[PDB]
Amino acid sequence: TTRLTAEDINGAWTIMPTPSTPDASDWRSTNTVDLDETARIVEELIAAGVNGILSMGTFGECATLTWEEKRDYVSTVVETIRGRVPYFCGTTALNTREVIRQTRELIDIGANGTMLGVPMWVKMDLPTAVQFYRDVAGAVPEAAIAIYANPEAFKFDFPRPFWAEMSKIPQVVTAKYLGIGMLDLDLKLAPNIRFLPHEDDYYAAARINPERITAFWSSGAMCGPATAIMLRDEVERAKSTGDWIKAKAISDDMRAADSTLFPRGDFSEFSKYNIGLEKARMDAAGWLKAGPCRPPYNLVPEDYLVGAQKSGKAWAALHAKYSK
Amino acid sequence: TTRLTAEDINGAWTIMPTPSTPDASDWRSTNTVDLDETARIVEELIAAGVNGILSMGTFGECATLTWEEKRDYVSTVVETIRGRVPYFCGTTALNTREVIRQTRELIDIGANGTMLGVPMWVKMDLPTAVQFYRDVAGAVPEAAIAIYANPEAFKFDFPRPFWAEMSKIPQVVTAKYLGIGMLDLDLKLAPNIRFLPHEDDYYAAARINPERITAFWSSGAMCGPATAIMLRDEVERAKSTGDWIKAKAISDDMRAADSTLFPRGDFSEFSKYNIGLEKARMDAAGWLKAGPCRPPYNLVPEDYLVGAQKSGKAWAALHAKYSK
Q: Give residue ranges of A with CB < 8 Å to any B CB.
A: 27-28, 30, 58, 62-66, 92-98, 100, 118-125, 127-129, 131-132, 135, 139, 152-153, 271-275, 294-299
Min Cα separation A172/chain B (Å) = 18
- Whether residue B296 and residue A121 make contact (CB cut-off 8 A), yes or no, is no
DSSP B147-176: EE--HHHHS----HHHHHHHTTSTTEEEEE
Alpha carbon distances (Å) from A63 to A69, A133, B122, B232, B276: 12, 19, 8, 41, 25
Contacts with A212 (C-beta within 8 Å, 6 or more apart), sequence order: A187, A194, A195
Residue B198 DSSP code: B
Which helix (H) or strand (E) segment holds residue A146: the answer is: strand A144-148
- Whether residue B27 and residue A100 make contact (CB cut-off 8 A), yes or no, is yes
Helix ranges (H only) for chain A are 35-48, 67-81, 96-109, 126-139, 151-154, 160-166, 183-189, 199-208, 226-241, 245-257, 267-272, 274-285, 302-321
Which helix (H) or strand (E) segment holds residue B222: the answer is: none
- Whether residue A95 and residue B296 make contact (CB cut-off 8 A), yes or no, is yes
For helices B302-321 and B274-285, what crossing angle results, to 10°?
50
Nearest CB among B119, B132, B296 relative to A131 is that of B296
For residue A271, give the nearest of B272, B94, B124, B157 by alpha carbon: B124
C-alpha gyration radius of chain A = 18
Q: Lay out the sheet containing A215-218: strands in order across.
A: A194-196, A172-176, A144-148, A113-116, A87-90, A52-55, A11-16, A215-218
Closest-approach residue (CA) in chain A for B298: A128
Nearest CB among B118, B123, B299 relative to A127 is that of B299
Phi and psi angles of residue B145, each rounded to the nearest 5 degrees, phi first: -125, 130
Contacts with B93 (C-beta within 8 Å, 6 or more apart), sequence order: A94, B99, B102, B119
Angle among Cα A218, A223, A225 to the nearest 5 degrees reads 60
> Residue A123 is part of which domain span?
1-324
| Strand residue runs (E) in chain B | 11-16, 52-55, 87-90, 113-116, 144-148, 172-176, 194-196, 215-218
User: To probe the interface with B, which of A122, A162, A303 has the most B CB atoms within 10 Å?
Assistant: A122
Nearest CB among B66, B121, B275 relative to A153 is that of B121
Distance CA A80, CA A46 (A): 10
Catalytic entry in B70, B123, B168, B176: B176
Contact A160, A181 (CB under 8 A): no
Contact A279, A289 (CB under 8 A): no
Residue B13 DSSP code: E
| C-beta neighbour count of A245 within 10 angstroms | 8
Chain centre distance of CA A35? 20
Residues of B in contact with A104 (CB under 8 A): none
Say how many residues make up chain B.
324
Closest-approach residue (CA) in chain B for A92: B121
> SS3 for A273?
coil
Buried b (16+ CB within 10 A) or exposed e, A77-93: bbebbeeebbbbbbbbb
Sign of the C-alpha dihedral, residues B39, B40, B41, B47? Answer: positive
Resolution (A): 1.9
Torsion region of A286: left, alpha or beta (phi above 0 gives left; psi -120 to 50 gives alpha) = left
Alpha carbon distances (Å) from A139 to A74, A98, A109, B33, B123: 21, 12, 17, 22, 30
Torsion region of A15: left, alpha or beta (phi above 0 gives left; psi -120 to 50 gives alpha) = beta
What's the domain count of chain A?
Answer: 1
Distance CA B96, CA A62 (A): 13
Say how many residues make up chain A.
324
Enumerate the β-bridge partners of residue A216: A12
Catalytic residue check, A176? yes
- Whether residue B58 and residue A120 make contact (CB cut-off 8 A), yes or no, is no
| C-beta neighbour count of A37 within 10 angstroms | 19
For helices B226-241 and B199-208, what crossing angle results, to 10°?
10
- C-alpha neighbours within 13 Å on the C-beta side of residue B274: 21
How much of chain B is helix, strand and coil, in % rounded to 5?
50, 10, 40
Angle among Cα A34, A36, A38 to the nearest 5 degrees reads 70
For residue B13, give the nearest of B213, B216, B307, B240 by alpha carbon: B216
Residue B298 DSSP code: -
Min Cα separation A226/chain B (Å) = 30
